[PDB]
Amino acid sequence: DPAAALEDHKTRTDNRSEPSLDNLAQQDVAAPGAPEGVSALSDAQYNEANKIYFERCAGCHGVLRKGATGKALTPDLTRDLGFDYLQSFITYGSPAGMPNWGTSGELSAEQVDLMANYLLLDPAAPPEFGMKEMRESWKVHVAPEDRPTQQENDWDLENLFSVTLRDAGQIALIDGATYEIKSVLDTGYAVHISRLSASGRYLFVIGRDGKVNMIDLWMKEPTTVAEIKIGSEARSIETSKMEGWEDKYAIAGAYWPPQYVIMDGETLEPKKIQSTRGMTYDEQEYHPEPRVAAILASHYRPEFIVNVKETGKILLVDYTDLDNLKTTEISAERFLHDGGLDGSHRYFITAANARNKLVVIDTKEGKLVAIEDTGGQTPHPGRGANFVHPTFGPVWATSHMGDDSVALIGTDPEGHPDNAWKILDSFPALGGGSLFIKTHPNSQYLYVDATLNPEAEISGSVAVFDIKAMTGDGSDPEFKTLPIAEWAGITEGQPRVVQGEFNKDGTEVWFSVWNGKDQESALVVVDDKTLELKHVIKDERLVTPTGKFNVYNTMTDTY
Template identity: 25%
Template sequence: MIRRRSVAALAALLPGVLPALALAQAPQPERLFAEHCAACHGGDRLGAIGPALLPENLGRLKPAEAERIIRHGRPATQMPGFPAETLSDEAVKALAAYVFTPLPAVPPWGMAEIAASRVVHRDPATLPDKPQHQADPLNLFTVVEAGDHHVSILDGDRFTVLDRFQSRFALHGGAKYSPDGRFVYFASRDGWISKYDLHSLGLVAEVRAGVNTRNVAVSTDGRYLMVGNTLPHTLVALDARDLSPVKVIPVTDGKGASSRVSAVYAMPPRNAFVAALKDFKEVWEMPWDDRPVYAGLVHSREPGREEGVALPGPFPVRKLKVDEYVDDFFFDQPYDQLMATSRDGKKGIVVHMDVGRQIAELDLPGMPHLGSGITFTHDGRPVMATPHFKDPVISVIDTVDWKTVKRIPMPGPGFFLRGHENTPYAWADAYMGRDRDLIPIIDTRSLEIVRTLRPAPGKLTAHVEFTRDGRYALVSVMEEDGAIIVYDAATFEEVRRLPMRKPIGKYNVWNKINYSSGTSH
């Protein structure tokens, strides 16, 4: 009682003292970060030997999980834990909140910053001419293991691991290959692009092309990479040989506004990269060849399409106006037309690249994941099929008249769908649903589920990829104590199980470089 009265009396006499004392005793996140985190993650939080610590780069990480990592560290990385005698619970909470606070301004990351970040591990001129292993170089798999930030190179015939190496933090699942299948390129969430040689099984070079990166695409002539960034708002062209920067393309409207990049892909028949934008109702096309490109138009065989003013420099931008903000997109198999989903996830649109405008809408509610769509022929008609994030269906769309052929009921909303030219079956998942351990298998002739597998009861199981001949299907158990499970694609019987650390994606060289109709690109 005496203490309480004394505090009250002090507060009455000196009204500014107690708030000042409380402020002085409260954890100061900027000071804590500078003292304990900046050496690895950079004083500006843009990353150093550790990843960038910005809300855009933390993905699905929750503040509670961030607090746990600060306290206990991250296994199989250089991230240490901070015991209570070093950081109090209040300090840990303050640090976790700080890294989820956006920066006051978009950091500059242009040609100079990109060039200065480049790391050359091996001179490209010293690389061997032939594979230094006995595996079929076109039947290798690149497996991204998110559990401990590693990549495994898997022999697709013997199902043995040829190499396993530490990757940059939080790789985007989609590895990309050079046209001959020799090199594989990775993009990390915090902007690092890595080039790895599948002949000698070693890193060649790395460069940081952005602060937060969506993905990377490879030109089909093997000369260039194009990186799509969400921070800063840029597209970055790199020389594929040594990852030196070629051009930074600001994603702006010329009036002061800018946009994040949703995704960037290569369109082989057009010799061009195509990017979808999150904040502009536009699709951008950027040729990598020497075609003359004009403001708003690309020189084509169509009469009257050559007017306009030529745009200077490499990778000139052709801007196509569309009716929706585009979050995800997919190409028909001839790569003439682009299918895209809107931000609200209630429908899709079709853009004809030669015509240069939107030509149709798609009846695709429930937030379809077009990036995991596949194409095949059904009843003599070309169709595409896509899972949905919110609805437990697979939608099958005719790519001639753009009508919905069927919605196949599924045990839960899915994330991935995969097929192969040499099998009539498409393998799906229930990734977003309650029964996340199921793998439904669809007969593309009847458009019915013919088998449902439960490879690892109670564990998230998804993402199928086939061997180059389509004989085997590889399934991921996406858990810390996960696995790659190999199935006979005809009998659906398990062949082998390889322990892996949260394998979020695996990509077959042959299927990727040949743009298989059954896999994503």
């Protein structure tokens, strides 16, 4: 019955992070005709409903309504349910999106009826975005021959932090030692991720609207040297990291259209576009909207590592020959999202989040090695945290959005075979709603945020575990609670702390204290050796600070 929406359409700590296609939602669409038994919506009503659908519903159900974490809502199925059921179900609203910018999920009576009617109509597919469109958007501001041949500024590039100023469509380049904002650059769109070329010279940023900017850190005044648009909705980018292939290529992954694009690493020239439309790995059924999620780069072969979410495929894409394109399509687990390489950089460990699994790929052999349930609800590692557990040996850790657990997986088949690819321990941190876990080789500490927790004090704090004290005896390791938001001294709202990131030396860890666009935010720097406050970064330009990426740690995959 319609009351089942209380369990499936209310906000959880782990259902607020599905895609919001708010860039694609800005496109106007044509209202379709309605077959017998169905009523048409006017152009305005249909567009109003489409905008709501794309911003709030398509993340879980698809723009094409063929299903993602939520089931299919195609007209054959919804017409069988009928308007009355749909109206009653949708009256409850839908899950809230991310804090500070996402939807509340609340709908007016008029909006409820629009949505029920929209679901009974036949949707069109949004426009494709191919090579002609990419080349039209492709601009080389500074040709390679006109760029410097050596660093022409006096900055400490490897210790720089590239910080997303989300809602301002900017990034800040901040000195990792002095905390000086060296520059604020316009991207003109909200940036999701910063990634660095393997040499550390080129900074790549991708916006949620599919725009890519490439910045030359050697210029006297670093700026965008090239830009291109690669889709309508995108969230991932990466650079080539195989020895001998430094600075050769960049790759971007899109949600819409479902595709990835390999670009020249010096100019952003679009070289190869690959659709990710295809069959689910398990049921082997066609899926028309398999979004690209995280993208990593192999250190063992000249390949990109591409997660294809809805089909549960991990792609190893060999960039040595883009005409005779060699790929390995690895059947994994559905709902792949984020992940990272182990400490040796050989094995890719990724969360198939809605199925509570970690998938492990051997990037040297090009094959699946393991799939293990974490025992927690909805793992969300980011790139995760590699460390040497005093008892277990090399491990990789993840925290979870759906519960307070931290899980450890053994990552050393050669030296610790009995622990390899097994979940070795699971223990609580601050609370549900964690997004990022972090450590560094020079630190003895494991930091765990709780960004999406509904309790303000918890979402403004970070748990810190002492790795040296871990025994793996089955007890719950104690943790210190750092009052990060309190240290930032922000009076307004309930700012959420998110994502630890270390400096190059691994002696200081930064957190974003993230408030909304019209509120006060900060970055907080923690002294890793003492766990004491080192510095609070505030500036009128520091608007909605979210992701932070140290140049050295990002170029080298040190996590």
